[PDB]
């Protein structure tokens, strides 16, 4: 791989420079190189991996949605035939998006999850596994779709089980996992009641634990609690 000759610390340093420059494709390539050195990632390094790939796949998902909507307007009654180009270009962006998700999933499987023993690393990686299967599910239409949805659900569920045994209800990883699994239920699994129940229980259990926190921890937890309440406001 093209980063094989670069020191691990230099890859981390350049990932941070790439973030500052809003060069997220470079950031992701640097962090892939760092993971492929074979050492476990620190907390900060796990968050650089997540920021890089979330920005890359976020642009692809936004593009895919725009193209899918145009392809939808084209298959309506009265719409002029314009040829294969919209489908072809949606397919090109879809394939690229699937490739990024497969790359992240492959890093998690080789070998980040198997080496992750502490709750804060293992939950973080299992959440990421759920997230990138969720992004695959957003574009899935084939014989595959049920198994991709179940892979997302399974990863999220294992992360949830660990988080509820090992982390306080205010832990930001635990909160963001619950937030994302609730969105999985709403947007992917056709389970809006499950989505709403999880968001409300998560919010209420975090509320009750805020008294234990420092000012800085309180700010970290309440930021994600607000996202839970924003979804509940949208959904109810």
């Amino acid at each position: 791989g093209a980063m094989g000759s670069m020191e691990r610390a230099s890859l981390i340093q350049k990932a941070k420079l790439a973030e500052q420059a809003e060069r997220y494709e470079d950031m992701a390539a640097f962090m892939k190189g760092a993971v492929e050195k074979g050492e476990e990632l620190s907390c900060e390094e796990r968050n650089l991996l997540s920021v890089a790939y979330k920005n890359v796949v976020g642009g692809q998902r936004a593009a895919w949605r725009v193209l899918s909507s145009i392809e939808q307007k084209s298959n309506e009654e009265g719409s002029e035939e314009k040829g294969p180009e919209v489908r072809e270009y949606r397919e090109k962006v879809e394939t690229e998006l699937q490739g990024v998700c497969d790359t992240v999933l492959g890093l998690l499987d080789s070998h980040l999850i198997k080496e992750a023993g502490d709750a804060e690393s293992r939950v973080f990686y299992l959440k990421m596994k759920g997230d990138y299967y969720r992004y695959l599910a957003e574009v899935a239409t084939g014989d595959d779709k049920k198994r991709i949805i179940d892979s997302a659900r399974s990863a999220y569920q294992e992360a949830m089980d660990i988080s509820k045994k090992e982390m306080p209800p205010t832990n930001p990883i635990r909160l963001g996992l619950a937030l994302n699994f609730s969105v999985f239920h709403y947007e992917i699994a056709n389970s809006p009641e499950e989505a709403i129940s999880l968001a409300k229980t998560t919010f209420d259990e975090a509320m009750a634990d805020l008294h234990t926190l420092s000012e800085d921890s309180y700010k970290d937890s309440t930021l994600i609690m607000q996202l839970l309440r924003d979804n509940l406001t949208l959904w109810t």
């Binding site: 997540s50 920021v51 996992l177 937030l179 994302n180 709403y186 994600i224 924003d230 979804n231």
Partner: peptide, 7 residues
Amino acid sequence: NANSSPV
């Protein structure tokens, strides 16, 4: 339009 976790 669902809010997911911020990176």
